[PDB]
Structure formats: structure tokens, C-alpha cells
Amino acid sequence: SKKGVGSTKNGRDSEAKRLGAKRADGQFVTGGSILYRQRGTKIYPGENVGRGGDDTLFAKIDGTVKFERFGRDRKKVSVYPV
Amino acid sequence: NRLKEKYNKEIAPALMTKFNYDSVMQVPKIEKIVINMGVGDAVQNAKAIDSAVEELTFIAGQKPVVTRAKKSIAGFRLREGMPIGAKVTLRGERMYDFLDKLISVSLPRVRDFRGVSKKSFDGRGNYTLGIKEQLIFPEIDYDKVTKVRGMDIVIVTTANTDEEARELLTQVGMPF
Amino acid sequence: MLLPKRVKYRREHRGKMRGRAKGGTEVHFGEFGIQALEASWITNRQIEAARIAMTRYMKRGGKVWIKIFPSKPYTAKPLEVRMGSGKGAPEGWVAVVKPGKVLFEISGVSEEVAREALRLASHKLPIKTKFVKRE
Amino acid sequence: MRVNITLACTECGERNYISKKNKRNNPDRVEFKKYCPRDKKSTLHRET
Amino acid sequence: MITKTSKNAARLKRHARVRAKLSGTAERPRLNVFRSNKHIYAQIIDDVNGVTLASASTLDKDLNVESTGDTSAATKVGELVAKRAAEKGISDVVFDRGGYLYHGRVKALADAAREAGLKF
RNA sequence: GCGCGGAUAGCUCAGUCGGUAGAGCAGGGGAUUGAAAAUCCCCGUGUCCUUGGUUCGAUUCCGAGUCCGCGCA
RNA sequence: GGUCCGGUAGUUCAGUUGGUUAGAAUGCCUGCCUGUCACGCAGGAGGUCGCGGGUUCGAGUCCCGUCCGGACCGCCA
RNA sequence: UGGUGGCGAUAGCGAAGAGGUCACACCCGUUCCCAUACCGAACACGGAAGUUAAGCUCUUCAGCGCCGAUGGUAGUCGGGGGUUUCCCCCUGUGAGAGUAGGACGCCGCCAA
RNA sequence: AGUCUUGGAGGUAGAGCACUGAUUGGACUAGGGGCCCCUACCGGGUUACCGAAUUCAGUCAAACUCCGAAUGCCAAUGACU
RNA sequence: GGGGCGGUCGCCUCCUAAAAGGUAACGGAGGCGCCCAAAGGUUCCCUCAGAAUGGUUGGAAAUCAUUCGCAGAGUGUAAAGGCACAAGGGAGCUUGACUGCGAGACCUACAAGUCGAGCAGGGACGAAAGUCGGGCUUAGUGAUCCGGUGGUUCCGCAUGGA
């Protein structure tokens, strides 16, 4: 014999988006290349690097990325041309 | 104006000898008189504040400001956005003009008068008064007034303690 | 029957218990306490029965302490069902006792009656225990 | 509630722009000053 | 005594607010003003090295005028710092008001620099 | 064995933050009447079936025992 | 055991939808009529919404959970 | 001493003390630019009566806040055991709330 | 590709209370019991009888984190294989 | 976790997730099928919530005044991230919620989805530098065929039209 149970009403979750570092420290990069995919301002951009529509960090010039500390707690990302 | 002359001539010297101030411009000074209307509106009639505004512009010398409610509370059926209360600040020669009218004509014209409250202070040299009647100076056209809600009077000085404001307001002319 | 009067979520994982106790290792408030020397779960029925066996024998001796609250719920599926199709309903409250934790603290009581009384309360628990006194 | 609106212009008839509007908030026929490609200049646009 | 903020202290927030959007590099240096209640100063700053290129003030040892705090002195000090830019010529400068409002003696300095010929 | 339900005035019943034991019937007395009842008022002597914790205070907030009724592949 | 329903004046039903007002018969109280009672005629109060929690300026009426009932189903060997 | 900068507050918050001829700032009064959803405190306007009181700068201090490795541990890579919902041994590696103390500022550039 | 050196991103184990919840005692009292009397408690005196708010000390947390490794990951340069 | 019955079918957010990304279950919690002519864009200016004390209608909070107050408050809406040099609030002006694009870059079986400097034309705001190709970021949404509507310097069966 059996007993009937159901109604979990929990089984859904969205398709998870790729977020994170897509270039490493010291990488040569190209003009227009993304460096970090964040969601909200985790890292403020520095020189030669912009901020996208959905807070994306993109390299304006081809160069070498460097990650640095900004202030007490925050990070900064920058591009140095070679 | 007259009060400014007396304050410059005698009030401030007397109290600066009395508190023995090293710098003579440490003298307490009355900074702002603000008059705040409050209507128990709650969507009963729009014209209550729409009467109090031009009543207060006759009481003072210029137009007041319709205050904005901060947040809604249904305990009065107060929806946020519809206007409640009025305010106007007075300074310059205007403040001494209003305090002149107050001491000269207004408090003697109250229906019953005993001495002003002993300890209506903030604790830090400011004073607040509550009067129940609009009959402040007799050339308000008293026949046109309908509602009886009086006025709220806030004088702000540079007093840091209560005692200096308490003593200075005596020679200003507040009975106690 | 130590009920947490409100709880954030009603179903957490059972978790795993590794290593020694985080805090409350030694006697702090009373003079003599009882310490557990291996890991297991502990539930409100046990804690209440232990406090009865402690305090009712102890009568007017002094006062007692508990430094364990069975905050974490544990669930169970209803009896005789096929497993699966949603987590079961919660039915009880449990606490973790990592080895090294002191269980109960005794106060205002001489050493030997507290000794035998903690020994009596030990059998209510499902764990191997050790007497520890204050330094 | 929101209805799509296709924008049109008097200074030249052929127009293309799609926007949204609330019929409570803008019951009246809205106007906007925009850049038409074929007039090659900025023009004032109604909608249909 | 009621907490009246220092006007300069309030000014620093607006000056940092405007300075977040702009800064004066090599061959594009930053104009800088001061609007003290008795005197008006002007300074030209290079940021990437932390050095100043040219500067001027009302309390300069020459061309003193009984204004010394009015818009006439503002125009005079503006074209003074314009030739100070001219001798070691940059011929370009970005504007940076010091947390002030572009209406008064700051504006007098501005078009003093303009007609004396520092291209903005 | 399990889940319950109860056992509270003579009887039928209530009785949740613990806030000094309740109603109706019954009994008795008084009121009314020529008397009586119907009627009105007053008068309850309740180990709340036993054993523990708690409390200033526990049918009360519970715990486990006694009796009986309600359902169990 | 699962699913769906409802939980409102003493009683029976609206309102439960309109988030922004708690109503209708009956009962009860008072007065009138009648010799008295009943009908009949004038007046009047009551609930603040099963419980607990959450959202909002504001929940009876929104959303969960607890309890009480009712309906349906619990099948193939 | 003023202006403007870089350095993670080791830069602070506090408690006290000094300064102003100059500079800075409080002050004076809105007349004309400009303004106060009401107002010359605020915006600007054009002066200089007195005022270090505050702002500001220097001097002191570990109260708070901050920085902080040393040896200990917890954890863990990899091996190897065991009575194995978990413990133990070894080559490494190295927790933070804990103190030794550091600190109540460092370097410019232009105008004295 | 492996390894050495070096640069990073990343908040797990750990640890911790700084936040969010939970939670234990000490102290304390706002305020709810507590009966009396004046009686509208007007208040007094009211048992530690309960009990918000602070502090002292202590305990937990997948949806707590002022911190935070080992590893793994992505790279650069040179060296060896 | 045999079928039936129950529940669910797409998209977004967190945990599960083992400190890169990814990672299942009828695992644990919520939301979405919009809204906003300003809740945009620029320019300019500020700053919270709560508490204490005074003040009447008036208080437990309506409206004022002072003081403390890193963020407890907001950030259109679910959660997460981030935000007080505003991304929070207020004011003026305006439509860049433009057209033609696009070096490159992420993600991905494909289809898809996402960012993007800079260029051209014409703007808006501001004096200028400069900003602006909607909302603070992530949801607020569907293939192709077929048909409707508007424009076309395209073709239109001998030619010219249709």
C-alpha cells in the first residue's frame, strides 16, 4: 500500500550567469576586451578601463591589466600599455 | 530695531560682565524665530490650511511655507502627499520686529495670562512656547477668523546651556 | 522543552560534527560541571529529563545552569511512506554537543552530592561523559 | 496600463518610432521632437 | 550654540565633487581659483606629478588695486595668470571652479582668461 | 500497545495569556396567595479520580499513574 | 493519508469582491395596545471578524501556518 | 603660515593648552548682479567696526577607534593507519578574536 | 604539458560576534501583576511576581560574516624536463 | 524513486555548491508575464532612519526646534551585489527611451543572449571640460510560416500599366 504526498513547491532556480575574472593579472589584452564580469560595483575601474551598462569592466586600449587595492577595502582594475 | 539698539548698548555688556566672557563676541544671540502652523487636516477640508496661510502672512510680514508631511500614517487617515501645516522663519530686523509685537501687545492681550512656563527649555538653550489664540496683534480682522488654533513659537539662540538663555530672555522681556 | 520562540528557516541540513568544541569548554559559572567527551545529538526531552534528575534530587541545594539550547530543528518524514517528493515536516528540536563542551553547571552545592547527582544525570544522556570541576 | 504607440510626423509623413504610453497618464496625443533619417534633421513627431 | 558648518568645509565637498569628473594633466592643466573673503587666488596645477605651473593672486607685489576682492581685481588677476601661462605657454587649460558657483568674480576671472587668450 | 476524549456542585454542564470556583436544574428559606404551584430573590459543604516540577498564586501550565467511552492492515 | 471548501451580533445568513463603511432577519431591552398574556405598533444596543504570524498608509476581506468542522479521493494486483 | 595633492584612519574620534600684525575665518549691510518651494546663516553682492570665541594650525596623552609578526594551536595538500555518521601518525603548509608593541601623521608642489 | 619562482581573482574548512537571527545568567529599571486605603489607583508601599531598554559574562547559525587558509583556478617571466 | 491521482513544465534571485566558472534531485526559500512622460538625460544643490528634550489641537507617532546619530533609511518591484565623492533626496531645462554603425570581448552544440571604446549625421544639457544609444545592475517574455499596416531610388510573364 502507499500514502500520497506531493506539493514541494520549491523546484525552480534560474539559469546561473557567468560572473568573474575572464582575464588574469599580467595578461596582454586587446582593445575592447572585458576583464571582470561583476554584478554591482565590486571593483571600481581605474585608468584606461571603463564601466559598462550592466556594470561591466572593459578595456579601452590594448595593454596589460593590473589589479590593485583601492582605499582600505576595495579593489581597482587598470590597464597599462606596454 | 529699538530692541537691537538696547541689545547692542546694554543687554550684551551686562551679561558679558555677568558671565565674565574673555571674548566679547561669545555673547549669546537670538538666531531664529520660526512660526510653525499645524492643522489637523486628515482630508477633512482643504481650506483650513488655505486660510491659515494668509492668516499667518498677516501675522508675520511675509508668506509662510506649506510644510510637507514626511510619511503616511493612517492613525489620523493621513495619506502622504496631501498638505499639512505651515511654517515660516523670521530673521534680520524681522525677528526683532516680531518679538517687539509679542512683548508689547500680544501676551497682555491673551484672554487669561499667568507667567510664561519656567522650564520649557530644550536643555541646550532653546525655548518653545505654545499659545492657544490667534489674537496676537489687534489689527488682525478678528471677525474673519473661524478656527481657533493658536500658534507655536520657537526661539533659537546661540546658548549652550539653559541658564544663559534663561537669564538673557529676562532682559529680553519674557515674564516668568 | 527549550523552545526557540522564533526561528529563521524551519528546515536546515543535519550538518556534520568534526573536532573539539568551539567554546564553553571549561566550567565558567558554577563550581562543578559535567562535560561530554564524544560527539552526538541532544534533544529537548533528554535535556528536560536530565534537569529533572538533577534538580529534583538536588532539592534546596542551590542553583543550576544550562549552556545548551536545542535551537536547530530536525525533521522526519511521516511514517510508512516512499522517500522523496519534498522534505518532511519538522517535529523536534536538537542541539549539537561537540566533544569538550560542558553540559550543565551546578552551584552552591558541596562536591560529593554534586558528584553523585551528576553521575545520576549522566545515565539520561546517550553519551560518554566526564566530570570536570572549576580550576 | 501601457499601449504601444507608433510615432508619426507632419513635416514628413513616413515615420517609424515605437514607444509606450499609459492612457490614464497621457490621454492626450503626445508630441516629441526627434531626428528623422529621411529629413536628415531633427523634426517634431506626433503618433498615429 | 547651533552647529553652523564652516563654509570652507562645506566647499570641500563640492570641490571634490567637481574634481571627481575632471583633472588637469600635462598640456591640459587644471585651472584653480580661490575666493577668500578678502582675496582671490588663481593657480595652475599638473596632477600626474603634483606640481604647479603658474599662479597669481590679488596680494601680488604689483598692480595692487583698492578693489582687492572685487570683480575688477578678479579680471586683472585672471589676465595676470593668463600671461603667467603665456611665458611658459600652455595655450590650453581645463576649467575647475573651486566648489563655487559660476556667476561672480570667478566668472570675471574666467572671461579675463578667455579674452587674454587661454583657450578652454 | 498507539492516538484521543473525558471523570468539575446532588444532577447536566462551563471554565486558556495563572489573576481569589461558575451557570441551569435540584434542595432549603423568604417574596406572592384564602393556601398551594407557576413566578422573583437569597442561601454551595467543589479533597476538579492519584503521584512530580514550576509559581506570590497552577481544573488553570504541564508530566506520568486509576476508571470508562471512542478507532486500529 | 492527500486535495478542495468555509470558520462573521446569542442563532441563522449577507459583507468575505470594492484593502480605505462591519450589515439583514430572528432573538433581547424599553415604551405603546390588551383585563392579562400572545400577536400587532414605536423606539435601541450588540459583534470588531477561529487563532497566530508576515506584506502595506492602512487588512474582515491580501499571503502563509495552527486548530475546528464539511466535501471528494485513497485505485492495479 | 595659506593653496592644492598622493599615501589603507599607523591620518581618526576624544581629552586638555596656546596662536592671529600677515594670511585664513568669524563679522558689517543688501544698493545692484544673483537667492532664499519662506529668509542675505545659504547662494552671491561690496567692505574691514572688533574677534581667536569657533573654524584652522601647532604642543601633550594610548580612553576609544586603527595597524600589528614572533612560538602555540584549529584547519588543510599529499602520504599511512584505525575499534571508521569518526579519530590518529608523518613530510609540508599555516587560523583569528591574543598579547610583544607601533601609532593621537608622512611626503611633495606654488604663494611668506 | 609538468615543475620552480612570482602576480592575481575568489569567501569554503576554520575561526568569530562587527551586522542579521537565535540563545544563557548577573545587575538594573521603563512598564505589565500586587493588595490596601483615600477611591477616577491621583499617587504611595507593594513580595524578584512578571518584565521592554542598557551593560557585564557566555553559547550557535546553508541561506550571519569585522576575518579567513590549505588546495584548486587563471596568468607572466625565466630555468629544467 | 512502478503507474494512476497529486504537483510541476518558461524566465529572474539566494543557499545547497566542496574560497575560479559550472554542477543534480518530486532539495531548501521568494519573485516575474509589469510599471515609470518621468520613478528618464544633462546641469546645479543637498543627506538619512531612529532616539532624547521642549511645544496645544497632539498622541505612542500628524507639524516645528535643538542635539546624538556609517547608514539601522532609502535605492519603483522579489532576493543578491553595490551605492552617502551617490546609484539616496530636491530644483531648472529637455527628449540620446537618436539614426548609420562598430575595433574587439564574454557565453555558448546550434539557435540565441550580453558588453563595448571609437567613427559619421544631427541634437539635448551645461560657459567649458564633458555626459547622454532609458531606469542602479540582474527578471517584466517566444522561433518560423501566413496575414494586416506604413514607406520604397526593387521586380513585375510580348510591350505599357496594373
PDB file of all heavy atoms in Angstrom, chain E residues 19-44:
ATOM      1  N   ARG E  19      35.883  67.803  -8.811  1.00  0.00           N
ATOM      2  CA  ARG E  19      37.203  67.288  -9.152  1.00  0.00           C
ATOM      3  C   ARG E  19      37.169  65.805  -9.478  1.00  0.00           C
ATOM      4  O   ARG E  19      38.118  65.281 -10.067  1.00  0.00           O
ATOM      5  CB  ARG E  19      38.170  67.551  -8.006  1.00  0.00           C
ATOM      6  CG  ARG E  19      38.940  68.830  -8.168  1.00  0.00           C
ATOM      7  CD  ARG E  19      40.190  68.571  -8.968  1.00  0.00           C
ATOM      8  NE  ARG E  19      41.130  67.759  -8.209  1.00  0.00           N
ATOM      9  CZ  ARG E  19      42.230  67.219  -8.714  1.00  0.00           C
ATOM     10  NH1 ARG E  19      42.560  67.381  -9.984  1.00  0.00           N
ATOM     11  NH2 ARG E  19      43.019  66.497  -7.924  1.00  0.00           N
ATOM     12  N   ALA E  20      36.106  65.110  -9.077  1.00  0.00           N
ATOM     13  CA  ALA E  20      35.969  63.713  -9.464  1.00  0.00           C
ATOM     14  C   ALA E  20      35.742  63.570 -10.961  1.00  0.00           C
ATOM     15  O   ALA E  20      36.092  62.540 -11.544  1.00  0.00           O
ATOM     16  CB  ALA E  20      34.825  63.060  -8.693  1.00  0.00           C
ATOM     17  N   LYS E  21      35.166  64.585 -11.598  1.00  0.00           N
ATOM     18  CA  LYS E  21      34.887  64.499 -13.023  1.00  0.00           C
ATOM     19  C   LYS E  21      36.024  65.009 -13.891  1.00  0.00           C
ATOM     20  O   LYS E  21      36.053  64.703 -15.088  1.00  0.00           O
ATOM     21  CB  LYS E  21      33.615  65.277 -13.361  1.00  0.00           C
ATOM     22  CG  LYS E  21      32.349  64.671 -12.795  1.00  0.00           C
ATOM     23  CD  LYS E  21      31.141  65.121 -13.596  1.00  0.00           C
ATOM     24  CE  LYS E  21      29.964  65.448 -12.696  1.00  0.00           C
ATOM     25  NZ  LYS E  21      28.674  65.353 -13.434  1.00  0.00           N
ATOM     26  N   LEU E  22      36.961  65.776 -13.338  1.00  0.00           N
ATOM     27  CA  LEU E  22      37.982  66.398 -14.165  1.00  0.00           C
ATOM     28  C   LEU E  22      39.250  66.662 -13.364  1.00  0.00           C
ATOM     29  O   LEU E  22      39.225  66.839 -12.143  1.00  0.00           O
ATOM     30  CB  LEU E  22      37.441  67.681 -14.813  1.00  0.00           C
ATOM     31  CG  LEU E  22      36.595  68.721 -14.062  1.00  0.00           C
ATOM     32  CD1 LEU E  22      37.224  69.312 -12.801  1.00  0.00           C
ATOM     33  CD2 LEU E  22      36.184  69.820 -15.014  1.00  0.00           C
ATOM     34  N   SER E  23      40.366  66.700 -14.083  1.00  0.00           N
ATOM     35  CA  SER E  23      41.687  66.903 -13.508  1.00  0.00           C
ATOM     36  C   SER E  23      42.619  67.337 -14.630  1.00  0.00           C
ATOM     37  O   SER E  23      42.393  67.018 -15.799  1.00  0.00           O
ATOM     38  CB  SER E  23      42.194  65.634 -12.820  1.00  0.00           C
ATOM     39  OG  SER E  23      41.451  65.359 -11.644  1.00  0.00           O
ATOM     40  N   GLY E  24      43.666  68.073 -14.263  1.00  0.00           N
ATOM     41  CA  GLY E  24      44.478  68.742 -15.264  1.00  0.00           C
ATOM     42  C   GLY E  24      45.842  68.154 -15.555  1.00  0.00           C
ATOM     43  O   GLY E  24      46.811  68.428 -14.843  1.00  0.00           O
ATOM     44  N   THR E  25      45.939  67.391 -16.638  1.00  0.00           N
ATOM     45  CA  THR E  25      47.154  66.669 -16.972  1.00  0.00           C
ATOM     46  C   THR E  25      48.154  67.578 -17.686  1.00  0.00           C
ATOM     47  O   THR E  25      47.974  68.794 -17.785  1.00  0.00           O
ATOM     48  CB  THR E  25      46.815  65.443 -17.816  1.00  0.00           C
ATOM     49  OG1 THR E  25      47.979  64.621 -17.965  1.00  0.00           O
ATOM     50  CG2 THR E  25      46.281  65.851 -19.185  1.00  0.00           C
ATOM     51  N   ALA E  26      49.246  66.972 -18.157  1.00  0.00           N
ATOM     52  CA  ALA E  26      50.211  67.684 -18.984  1.00  0.00           C
ATOM     53  C   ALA E  26      49.543  68.150 -20.265  1.00  0.00           C
ATOM     54  O   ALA E  26      48.643  67.489 -20.783  1.00  0.00           O
ATOM     55  CB  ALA E  26      51.407  66.790 -19.300  1.00  0.00           C
ATOM     56  N   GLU E  27      49.918  69.355 -20.701  1.00  0.00           N
ATOM     57  CA  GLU E  27      49.366  70.090 -21.852  1.00  0.00           C
ATOM     58  C   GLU E  27      47.835  70.221 -21.812  1.00  0.00           C
ATOM     59  O   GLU E  27      47.217  70.633 -22.798  1.00  0.00           O
ATOM     60  CB  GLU E  27      49.838  69.510 -23.199  1.00  0.00           C
ATOM     61  CG  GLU E  27      49.132  68.279 -23.766  1.00  0.00           C
ATOM     62  CD  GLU E  27      49.879  66.996 -23.477  1.00  0.00           C
ATOM     63  OE1 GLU E  27      51.078  67.073 -23.136  1.00  0.00           O
ATOM     64  OE2 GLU E  27      49.267  65.913 -23.587  1.00  0.00           O
ATOM     65  N   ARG E  28      47.214  69.937 -20.672  1.00  0.00           N
ATOM     66  CA  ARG E  28      45.796  70.154 -20.429  1.00  0.00           C
ATOM     67  C   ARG E  28      45.610  70.425 -18.942  1.00  0.00           C
ATOM     68  O   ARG E  28      44.831  69.721 -18.292  1.00  0.00           O
ATOM     69  CB  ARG E  28      44.974  68.928 -20.838  1.00  0.00           C
ATOM     70  CG  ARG E  28      44.597  68.842 -22.311  1.00  0.00           C
ATOM     71  CD  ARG E  28      43.339  69.618 -22.659  1.00  0.00           C
ATOM     72  NE  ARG E  28      42.114  68.870 -22.400  1.00  0.00           N
ATOM     73  CZ  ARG E  28      40.897  69.388 -22.485  1.00  0.00           C
ATOM     74  NH1 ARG E  28      40.708  70.653 -22.820  1.00  0.00           N
ATOM     75  NH2 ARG E  28      39.844  68.620 -22.224  1.00  0.00           N
ATOM     76  N   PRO E  29      46.295  71.427 -18.359  1.00  0.00           N
ATOM     77  CA  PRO E  29      46.344  71.519 -16.897  1.00  0.00           C
ATOM     78  C   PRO E  29      45.054  72.070 -16.330  1.00  0.00           C
ATOM     79  O   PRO E  29      44.196  72.534 -17.085  1.00  0.00           O
ATOM     80  CB  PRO E  29      47.510  72.477 -16.654  1.00  0.00           C
ATOM     81  CG  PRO E  29      47.406  73.415 -17.795  1.00  0.00           C
ATOM     82  CD  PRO E  29      46.889  72.623 -18.978  1.00  0.00           C
ATOM     83  N   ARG E  30      44.900  72.045 -15.013  1.00  0.00           N
ATOM     84  CA  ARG E  30      43.650  72.454 -14.398  1.00  0.00           C
ATOM     85  C   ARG E  30      43.764  73.889 -13.920  1.00  0.00           C
ATOM     86  O   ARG E  30      44.750  74.267 -13.281  1.00  0.00           O
ATOM     87  CB  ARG E  30      43.248  71.521 -13.250  1.00  0.00           C
ATOM     88  CG  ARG E  30      44.246  71.364 -12.123  1.00  0.00           C
ATOM     89  CD  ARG E  30      43.782  70.288 -11.155  1.00  0.00           C
ATOM     90  NE  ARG E  30      42.655  70.708 -10.331  1.00  0.00           N
ATOM     91  CZ  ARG E  30      42.760  71.154  -9.089  1.00  0.00           C
ATOM     92  NH1 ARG E  30      43.929  71.218  -8.475  1.00  0.00           N
ATOM     93  NH2 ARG E  30      41.664  71.537  -8.442  1.00  0.00           N
ATOM     94  N   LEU E  31      42.775  74.691 -14.283  1.00  0.00           N
ATOM     95  CA  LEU E  31      42.580  75.982 -13.659  1.00  0.00           C
ATOM     96  C   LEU E  31      42.131  75.774 -12.220  1.00  0.00           C
ATOM     97  O   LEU E  31      41.447  74.807 -11.893  1.00  0.00           O
ATOM     98  CB  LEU E  31      41.561  76.790 -14.463  1.00  0.00           C
ATOM     99  CG  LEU E  31      40.953  78.116 -14.019  1.00  0.00           C
ATOM    100  CD1 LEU E  31      40.582  78.889 -15.254  1.00  0.00           C
ATOM    101  CD2 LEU E  31      39.694  77.887 -13.211  1.00  0.00           C
ATOM    102  N   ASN E  32      42.544  76.683 -11.346  1.00  0.00           N
ATOM    103  CA  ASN E  32      42.090  76.614  -9.968  1.00  0.00           C
ATOM    104  C   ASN E  32      41.974  78.018  -9.419  1.00  0.00           C
ATOM    105  O   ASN E  32      42.819  78.878  -9.668  1.00  0.00           O
ATOM    106  CB  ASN E  32      43.026  75.794  -9.091  1.00  0.00           C
ATOM    107  CG  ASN E  32      42.306  74.706  -8.339  1.00  0.00           C
ATOM    108  OD1 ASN E  32      41.149  74.404  -8.623  1.00  0.00           O
ATOM    109  ND2 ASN E  32      42.982  74.111  -7.366  1.00  0.00           N
ATOM    110  N   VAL E  33      40.917  78.232  -8.649  1.00  0.00           N
ATOM    111  CA  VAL E  33      40.608  79.540  -8.096  1.00  0.00           C
ATOM    112  C   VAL E  33      40.548  79.423  -6.583  1.00  0.00           C
ATOM    113  O   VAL E  33      40.462  78.321  -6.035  1.00  0.00           O
ATOM    114  CB  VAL E  33      39.283  80.099  -8.657  1.00  0.00           C
ATOM    115  CG1 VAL E  33      39.185  79.863 -10.146  1.00  0.00           C
ATOM    116  CG2 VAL E  33      38.112  79.441  -7.982  1.00  0.00           C
ATOM    117  N   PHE E  34      40.651  80.560  -5.909  1.00  0.00           N
ATOM    118  CA  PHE E  34      40.285  80.677  -4.509  1.00  0.00           C
ATOM    119  C   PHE E  34      39.487  81.960  -4.351  1.00  0.00           C
ATOM    120  O   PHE E  34      39.821  82.979  -4.961  1.00  0.00           O
ATOM    121  CB  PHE E  34      41.503  80.705  -3.593  1.00  0.00           C
ATOM    122  CG  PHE E  34      41.187  80.361  -2.170  1.00  0.00           C
ATOM    123  CD1 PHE E  34      40.019  79.702  -1.851  1.00  0.00           C
ATOM    124  CD2 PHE E  34      42.021  80.759  -1.146  1.00  0.00           C
ATOM    125  CE1 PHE E  34      39.710  79.400  -0.544  1.00  0.00           C
ATOM    126  CE2 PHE E  34      41.708  80.473   0.168  1.00  0.00           C
ATOM    127  CZ  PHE E  34      40.557  79.782   0.466  1.00  0.00           C
ATOM    128  N   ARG E  35      38.440  81.910  -3.539  1.00  0.00           N
ATOM    129  CA  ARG E  35      37.546  83.047  -3.390  1.00  0.00           C
ATOM    130  C   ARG E  35      37.408  83.410  -1.920  1.00  0.00           C
ATOM    131  O   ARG E  35      36.294  83.486  -1.394  1.00  0.00           O
ATOM    132  CB  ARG E  35      36.190  82.744  -4.023  1.00  0.00           C
ATOM    133  CG  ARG E  35      35.396  83.952  -4.453  1.00  0.00           C
ATOM    134  CD  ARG E  35      34.103  83.526  -5.119  1.00  0.00           C
ATOM    135  NE  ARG E  35      33.248  82.745  -4.234  1.00  0.00           N
ATOM    136  CZ  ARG E  35      32.327  83.265  -3.437  1.00  0.00           C
ATOM    137  NH1 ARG E  35      32.152  84.573  -3.345  1.00  0.00           N
ATOM    138  NH2 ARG E  35      31.560  82.452  -2.716  1.00  0.00           N
ATOM    139  N   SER E  36      38.545  83.578  -1.246  1.00  0.00           N
ATOM    140  CA  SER E  36      38.584  84.067   0.127  1.00  0.00           C
ATOM    141  C   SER E  36      37.869  85.405   0.255  1.00  0.00           C
ATOM    142  O   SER E  36      37.792  86.169  -0.712  1.00  0.00           O
ATOM    143  CB  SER E  36      40.029  84.196   0.606  1.00  0.00           C
ATOM    144  OG  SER E  36      40.108  84.977   1.784  1.00  0.00           O
ATOM    145  N   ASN E  37      37.353  85.700   1.451  1.00  0.00           N
ATOM    146  CA  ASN E  37      36.506  86.876   1.625  1.00  0.00           C
ATOM    147  C   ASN E  37      37.290  88.175   1.494  1.00  0.00           C
ATOM    148  O   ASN E  37      36.691  89.249   1.376  1.00  0.00           O
ATOM    149  CB  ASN E  37      35.807  86.817   2.980  1.00  0.00           C
ATOM    150  CG  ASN E  37      36.687  86.233   4.060  1.00  0.00           C
ATOM    151  OD1 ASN E  37      37.709  86.814   4.420  1.00  0.00           O
ATOM    152  ND2 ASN E  37      36.294  85.082   4.590  1.00  0.00           N
ATOM    153  N   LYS E  38      38.617  88.104   1.512  1.00  0.00           N
ATOM    154  CA  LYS E  38      39.447  89.280   1.352  1.00  0.00           C
ATOM    155  C   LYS E  38      40.323  89.242   0.112  1.00  0.00           C
ATOM    156  O   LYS E  38      40.823  90.294  -0.297  1.00  0.00           O
ATOM    157  CB  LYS E  38      40.335  89.470   2.589  1.00  0.00           C
ATOM    158  CG  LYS E  38      40.638  90.915   2.926  1.00  0.00           C
ATOM    159  CD  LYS E  38      41.099  91.054   4.368  1.00  0.00           C
ATOM    160  CE  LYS E  38      42.570  90.702   4.529  1.00  0.00           C
ATOM    161  NZ  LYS E  38      43.474  91.750   3.980  1.00  0.00           N
ATOM    162  N   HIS E  39      40.516  88.079  -0.504  1.00  0.00           N
ATOM    163  CA  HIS E  39      41.474  87.954  -1.591  1.00  0.00           C
ATOM    164  C   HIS E  39      41.050  86.845  -2.540  1.00  0.00           C
ATOM    165  O   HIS E  39      40.343  85.910  -2.160  1.00  0.00           O
ATOM    166  CB  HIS E  39      42.878  87.682  -1.052  1.00  0.00           C
ATOM    167  CG  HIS E  39      43.526  88.885  -0.446  1.00  0.00           C
ATOM    168  ND1 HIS E  39      43.936  89.963  -1.198  1.00  0.00           N
ATOM    169  CD2 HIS E  39      43.796  89.198   0.843  1.00  0.00           C
ATOM    170  CE1 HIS E  39      44.456  90.878  -0.400  1.00  0.00           C
ATOM    171  NE2 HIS E  39      44.381  90.440   0.842  1.00  0.00           N
ATOM    172  N   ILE E  40      41.506  86.958  -3.786  1.00  0.00           N
ATOM    173  CA  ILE E  40      41.209  85.993  -4.840  1.00  0.00           C
ATOM    174  C   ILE E  40      42.519  85.449  -5.384  1.00  0.00           C
ATOM    175  O   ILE E  40      43.368  86.216  -5.849  1.00  0.00           O
ATOM    176  CB  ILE E  40      40.382  86.620  -5.978  1.00  0.00           C
ATOM    177  CG1 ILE E  40      39.188  87.384  -5.412  1.00  0.00           C
ATOM    178  CG2 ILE E  40      39.938  85.556  -6.965  1.00  0.00           C
ATOM    179  CD1 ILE E  40      38.187  86.499  -4.705  1.00  0.00           C
ATOM    180  N   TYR E  41      42.676  84.132  -5.347  1.00  0.00           N
ATOM    181  CA  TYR E  41      43.883  83.481  -5.833  1.00  0.00           C
ATOM    182  C   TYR E  41      43.552  82.655  -7.064  1.00  0.00           C
ATOM    183  O   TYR E  41      42.422  82.191  -7.238  1.00  0.00           O
ATOM    184  CB  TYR E  41      44.545  82.552  -4.788  1.00  0.00           C
ATOM    185  CG  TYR E  41      45.001  83.134  -3.454  1.00  0.00           C
ATOM    186  CD1 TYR E  41      44.666  84.421  -3.046  1.00  0.00           C
ATOM    187  CD2 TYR E  41      45.816  82.384  -2.614  1.00  0.00           C
ATOM    188  CE1 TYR E  41      45.096  84.927  -1.839  1.00  0.00           C
ATOM    189  CE2 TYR E  41      46.252  82.882  -1.403  1.00  0.00           C
ATOM    190  CZ  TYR E  41      45.891  84.154  -1.021  1.00  0.00           C
ATOM    191  OH  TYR E  41      46.326  84.654   0.186  1.00  0.00           O
ATOM    192  N   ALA E  42      44.553  82.479  -7.918  1.00  0.00           N
ATOM    193  CA  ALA E  42      44.449  81.620  -9.085  1.00  0.00           C
ATOM    194  C   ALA E  42      45.697  80.757  -9.181  1.00  0.00           C
ATOM    195  O   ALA E  42      46.812  81.229  -8.952  1.00  0.00           O
ATOM    196  CB  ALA E  42      44.274  82.429 -10.369  1.00  0.00           C
ATOM    197  N   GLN E  43      45.505  79.484  -9.518  1.00  0.00           N
ATOM    198  CA  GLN E  43      46.606  78.534  -9.569  1.00  0.00           C
ATOM    199  C   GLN E  43      46.413  77.601 -10.757  1.00  0.00           C
ATOM    200  O   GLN E  43      45.280  77.292 -11.133  1.00  0.00           O
ATOM    201  CB  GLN E  43      46.700  77.725  -8.268  1.00  0.00           C
ATOM    202  CG  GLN E  43      47.157  78.508  -7.045  1.00  0.00           C
ATOM    203  CD  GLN E  43      47.894  77.651  -6.033  1.00  0.00           C
ATOM    204  OE1 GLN E  43      47.554  77.638  -4.850  1.00  0.00           O
ATOM    205  NE2 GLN E  43      48.914  76.938  -6.490  1.00  0.00           N
ATOM    206  N   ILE E  44      47.525  77.158 -11.341  1.00  0.00           N
ATOM    207  CA  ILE E  44      47.535  76.188 -12.433  1.00  0.00           C
ATOM    208  C   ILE E  44      48.300  74.963 -11.952  1.00  0.00           C
ATOM    209  O   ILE E  44      49.453  75.080 -11.520  1.00  0.00           O
ATOM    210  CB  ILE E  44      48.168  76.764 -13.706  1.00  0.00           C
ATOM    211  CG1 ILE E  44      47.393  77.993 -14.180  1.00  0.00           C
ATOM    212  CG2 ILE E  44      48.228  75.710 -14.790  1.00  0.00           C
ATOM    213  CD1 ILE E  44      45.906  77.767 -14.327  1.00  0.00           C
TER     214      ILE E  44
END
